[PDB]
Amino acid sequence: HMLTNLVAEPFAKLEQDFGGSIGVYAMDTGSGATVSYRAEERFPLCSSFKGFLAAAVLARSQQQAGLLDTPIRYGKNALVPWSPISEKYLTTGMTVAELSAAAVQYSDNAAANLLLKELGGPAGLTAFMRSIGDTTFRLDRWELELNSAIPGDARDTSSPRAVTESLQKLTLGSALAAPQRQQFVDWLKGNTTGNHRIRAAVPADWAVGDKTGTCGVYGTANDYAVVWPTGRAPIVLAVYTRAPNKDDKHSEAVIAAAARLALEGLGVNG
Numbered sequence: 001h002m003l004t005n006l007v008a009e010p011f012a013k014l015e016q017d018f019g020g021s022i023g024v025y026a027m028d029t030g031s032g033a034t035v036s037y038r039a040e041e042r043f044p045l046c047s048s049f050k051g052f053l054a055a056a057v058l059a060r061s062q063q064q065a066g067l068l069d070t071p072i073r074y075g076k077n078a079l080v081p082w083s084p085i086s087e088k089y090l091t092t093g094m095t096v097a098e099l100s101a102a103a104v105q106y107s108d109n110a111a112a113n114l115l116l117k118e119l120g121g122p123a124g125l126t127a128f129m130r131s132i133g134d135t136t137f138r139l140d141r142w143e144l145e146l147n148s149a150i151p152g153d154a155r156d157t158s159s160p161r162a163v164t165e166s167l168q169k170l171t172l173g174s175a176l177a178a179p180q181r182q183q184f185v186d187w188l189k190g191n192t193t194g195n196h197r198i199r200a201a202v203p204a205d206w207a208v209g210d211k212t213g214t215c216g217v218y219g220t221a222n223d224y225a226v227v228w229p230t231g232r233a234p235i236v237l238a239v240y241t242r243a244p245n246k247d248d249k250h251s252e253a254v255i256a257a258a259a260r261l262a263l264e265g266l267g268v269n270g
């Protein structure tokens with residue numbers, strides 16, 4: 001309450017220029033100060049669910065020490081459009097860890113569906129999120145159906161706030177054991193798909209891990225990140241967008257701009 005939105009930022013103008021809705025939640029983990037705009041509205045997860053998927057796999061690996069190095073062979077029928085890594089290993093298979101890294105760092109769709117199967121499907125990932133205290137997250141469908149981003153549909157959505165809170169628990173808090181936590185962080189740090197989103201607002205000399213999503217319809221795209229500014233506590237943040245019309249375009253620039261406003265609202269010099 002008292003530390004939320006101490007400094008107002010022009011999010012409304014930004015989303016109006018975009019032609020849609022922007023949802024932002026950012027927390028300074030040192031002071032507890034927050035920036036919050038549409039933070040409790042639901043937005044489609046799109047590929048951003050794959051970060052939480054990889055965390056759920058790591059949590060399972062705490063009870064199954066051989067899980068991450070298990071080899072997984074798959075057929076051509078497992079390939080889904082946008083499977084840039086797993087298509088190169090169709091004839092060989094990949095380990096669970098490799099599928100997880102591919103899902104996080106390349107948004108690989110086939111990898112994500114294979115790992116969902118390992119966890120018992122969308123309800124199994126939802127159950128993992130409930131287990132860390134996230135009551136907002138829901139995954140309902142598989143790739144590619146979960147990308148429909150229909151206005152008003154709560155399937156396959158969360159809120160910026162719940163995403164940020166869960167990300168904090170998994171990357172900085174105690175939801176994962178220490179080895180698994182650092183592996184999750186390392187996967188996020190190695191992401192390749194986010195250079196034009198939150199990372200574009202973050203100085204190059206700060207560490208950052210992130211996970212993106214792009215539904216392909218309804219102007220719907222997103223990014224969440226942990227950011228380590230030097231000399232102060234980390235910042236966790238989530239930026240989600242959507243728009244009213246199916247043919248509306250997403251904007252990476254709008255995501256980067258919203259992330260800049262969030263950092264400015266927290267008084268984090270960048």
Ligand SMILES: *[B@@]1([O])O[C]([C]C([O])=O)[C][C][C]1[N]C(=O)[C]C1=[C][C]=[C]S1
Pocket residue numbers: 045046047048081082106107109144147193211212213214215216
């Ligand atoms: B996912 O929602 O988003 C990925 C891109 C990202 O992480 O920002 C691509 C795979 C998933 N999306 C789709 O399959 C539909 C597409 C949208 C743009 C390229 S593919």
